[PDB]
């Protein structure tokens, strides 16, 4: 099936308090594999996955350098942007970058990404063709000009289409057991009630991987969307996810509701009844 | 593997 590798960088300026806090994490699918934090002790790219631990010292040396490059680039950007918008020296602001590639089931190139965001809002992103840019405001346009002039897109394209892909395959292959797996959700249902007329019916999905899942309550066969409390998919902490939907049911109506769980690990979609 | 040519905005 499809696969993807993504890197996420966050830099928050600390006016007065010191140099901007920089965190960088990389993921292959829903599994985090490498990291870096400016406030950590090592000042090196660290392995956060057992399969990456096997990588040579040159990898860690070479990756520590480049990641530190990413750090310096953002440190500069924070101020550059403070200027673009004409903001105060005293304000803490954020810069965020995400980039990655997706391979199909044939493990070949599919799509490349690269997005930059300043203060939680889109700033500039590379268009799907990996040749042009989408700049939000006037500032983004300045940067757009800079990057078109320095032919940045042409270098990212060679990274996304080539090196990003090549490495993902490597990771997938060395991390086979972990990465190339599908843990279907272990479902079940609970019944809570603190009153003599209403009982809350909660449907669960635990120990599933990847994180993509669709959990839905229905009454007599009618989507129960607006009357359902759905919690955001949450990590278990061991490499799997959790999730749950809950509806308030008037006593006697229990047999009317049905929970519907959809997930890659499930051959056929499940339907749980309170029986 | 990370990208090797980030540029200032």
């Amino acid at each position, epitope marked *: 099936g499809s696969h993807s590798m993504r890197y996420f960088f966050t830099s928050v300026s600390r006016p007065g308090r010191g140099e901007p806090r920089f965190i960088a994490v990389g993921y292959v699918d829903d599994t985090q594999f490498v990291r870096f934090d400016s406030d950590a002790a090592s000042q090196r790219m660290e392995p956060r996955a057992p399969w990456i631990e096997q990588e040579g010292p*040159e990898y860690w040396d070479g990756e520590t*350098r480049k990641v530190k490059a990413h750090s310096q680039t953002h440190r500069v950007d924070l101020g550059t942007l403070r200027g673009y918008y004409n903001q105060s020296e005293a304000g803490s602001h954020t810069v965020q970058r995400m980039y990655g590639c997706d391979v199909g089931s044939d493990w070949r190139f599919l799509r490349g990404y690269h997005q930059y965001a300043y203060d939680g809002k889109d700033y500039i992103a590379l268009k799907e063709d990996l040749r042009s840019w989408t700049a939000a405001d006037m500032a983004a346009q300045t940067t757009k000009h800079k990057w078109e*002039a320095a032919h940045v897109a042409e270098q990212l394209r060679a990274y996304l289409e080539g090196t990003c892909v090549e490495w993902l395959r490597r990771y997938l292959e060395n991390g086979k057991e972990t990465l190339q797996r599908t843990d279907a959700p272990k479902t079940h249902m609970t019944h809570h009630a603190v009153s003599d007329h209403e009982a809350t019916l909660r449907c669960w999905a635990l120990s599933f991987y990847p994180a993509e899942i669709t959990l839905t309550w229905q009454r007599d066969g009618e989507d129960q969307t607006q009357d359902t409390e759905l919690v955001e998919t949450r990590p278990a902490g061991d490499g799997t996810f959790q999730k749950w939907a809950a509806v308030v049911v008037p006593s006697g109506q229990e047999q009317r509701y049905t929970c519907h769980v959809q997930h890659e690990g499930l051959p056929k979609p499940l339907t749980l009844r309170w029986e | 593997l990370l990208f090797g040519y980030p540029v200032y905005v």
Partner: T-cell receptor
Amino acid sequence: QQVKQNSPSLSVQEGRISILNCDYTNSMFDYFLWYKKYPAEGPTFLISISSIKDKNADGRFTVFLNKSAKHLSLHIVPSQPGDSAVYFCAAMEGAQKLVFGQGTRLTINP
Amino acid sequence: GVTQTPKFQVLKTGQSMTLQCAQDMNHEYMSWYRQDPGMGLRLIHYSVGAGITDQGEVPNGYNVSRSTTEDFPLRLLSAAPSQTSVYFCASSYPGGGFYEQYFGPGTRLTVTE
């Protein structure tokens, strides 16, 4: 991160073609380029090639990448006597690390 | 461009020596290489920017510093016959689109007993 340029020397009559070959080690090299060096001077950037392209050419110089074999090349056609120089094949591991090879003395004979 | 002094130098094993490298292009990254007959050029130390320095392939015997973005001086604390080579200084500005590196003229150095 080794870049191996076998064949230390090479002489080619004027007007003929001169092909300098190169091989490398780490799969972590993302940019490939060539430097030309004159005597008593520092190395000069000569031409580059992105990790994804196969060939590239700036008037008379053509670079060939073949990642499957981890081998880069440079074709100088037509070679002129001013071309005599030591040509260094290089590759970067990001933009803050350059790795050169042994270099090859090209002697274009008039 | 990138200038480096002296052009030629002779030292006796034990003498310290500092190679001067100056770039006037406001380039943030500067590096030090050395060319020997058998192995092309090799990186000694490099600096990604003012106040920052890190070792390369062959860093033993040399120290380096960067208190200014303009200069990157290469110190040999106590010369040895092995340090007999031609040294080159280089600079580039990566975070601005200049990945292509620029080399200074080079300084020949010979050390005798």
